[PDB]
Amino acid sequence: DKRDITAIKNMAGCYEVSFNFSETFSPNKEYKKKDNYHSKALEWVAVVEEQPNKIALQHLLVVNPKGEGKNAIVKHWRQDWLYENTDLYVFNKENHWKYKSLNPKQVKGQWTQIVYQVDDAPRYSGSGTWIHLDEKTFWESTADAPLPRREYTTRTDYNVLNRTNRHEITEWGWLHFQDNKKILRQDNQEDTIVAEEIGKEYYKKIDDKKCLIAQNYWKEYAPLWAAVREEWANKMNKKQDLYVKPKVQDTYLYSELMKLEPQQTTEAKELVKKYIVK
């Protein structure tokens, strides 16, 4: 179904995003639910790569609309879509992502979505079939993920967020629905659900012109980010587990990459390798 490509590419554009999360259930009766979350943003999603069965989508955030360049844009998670892919990198705990090879017969008709981090490192991976039935266009998958900032800045109750993600194309844009389980993963033990949350992320399509600051940034700095991507790919094509340093020399990778200029491709690649433990 080629309607599958239409749906992925319908997640591209200029959007005003409403971020919303509410806690729901817990296996502990004494659990005290945390207050609900709401944020807002201006996001431009771009199609960085279109290949025969690969579509890559980069999210960029416009923080200052009255500005120009990189100081007005903050990069956001990338979303890569691969058809009938058997090679996945999934989150275990901490800074460990493990290679998982899927059965090639279960991934038939399916698309794998690999969501990446701001520094372009792997964040989470899942596979599923796009459904174009009942006047609805949706995709669902479940994936273990690193804790987001809204959570690590607020609590230490858990280490893995299991996300059941749903991507639905809508009249006004798209919705990223999430039914998440907050899990405590400890070694040689079974996972424990500390709590659960529901999230509804609304992307309302607006005119592309209102996201021009980001389009102009990417025109210039795209070649650099392609090299960052290529290096991560070199590691992950070796099909071995990935361990990633969070900070080297009290500096994070995204910050170092951002300081770099558009043509400093070689330098960028060396930086990625400096944050890969192997």
Add this chain to the structure above:
Amino acid sequence: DKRDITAIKNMAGCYEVSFNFSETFSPNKEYKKKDNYHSKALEWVAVVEEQPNKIALQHLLVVNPKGEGKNAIVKHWRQDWLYENTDLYVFNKENHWKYKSLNPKQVKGQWTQIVYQVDDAPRYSGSGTWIHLDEKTFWESTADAPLPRREYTTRTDYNVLNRTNRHEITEWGWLHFQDNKKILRQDNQEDTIVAEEIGKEYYKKIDDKKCLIAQNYWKEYAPLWAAVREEWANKMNKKQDLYVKPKVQDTYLYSELMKLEPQQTTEAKELVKKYIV
């Protein structure tokens, strides 16, 4: 798909149900969320009617497992499944259900689930396709519905519950996931969503023995209820709107039927037609 029929019939058996409801979002920022609802129950789901394009499932609750017969059993929502159905009764508001016709083109591959109440009156209807992909077996649809007991016993804040219902077959049984919206449809202001709720009902499969008390009741009282279904069907097959009197003589219908005996079929059909306007 054949697997379609297999999926509906896997929603049957003896189950231990866990009911879980949590309010989530509201457009009123000053809204105070209500406490979460949790309950448990023992239920028997049975296949009462199976024809090629219609499968009906009756839910019966065992309230006392050390009991005998009728007073140990409480009737629960019937679930009728109809393939490629164009005739639906949809909840509007306040004891009124409106007839809706659908174009056969929209319902291809789809099944309609009409959920009925304890008095076998209609509650909600919706249509959707069963998905058998990704090692998952699911069905989803959206339907405006009347308020449940959990809510009418406690709130007058709203009058219609919009429900997005997901029925998924699982190894342990089935799950009823609910993404619902709480709406006030009114006068002097229009549809207001008061709050949103998420519900997850877990129907875990257990030994049939635990549900026999109910199986026995059904063997005896089945024909009375077949008769109640016959009268409602008469009204509904006339494809016109339905208004149901909530109470006559300050008496509810289920209560009257529940005061009857298997033999009393005519009286039942008569009691039903008393509450039909």
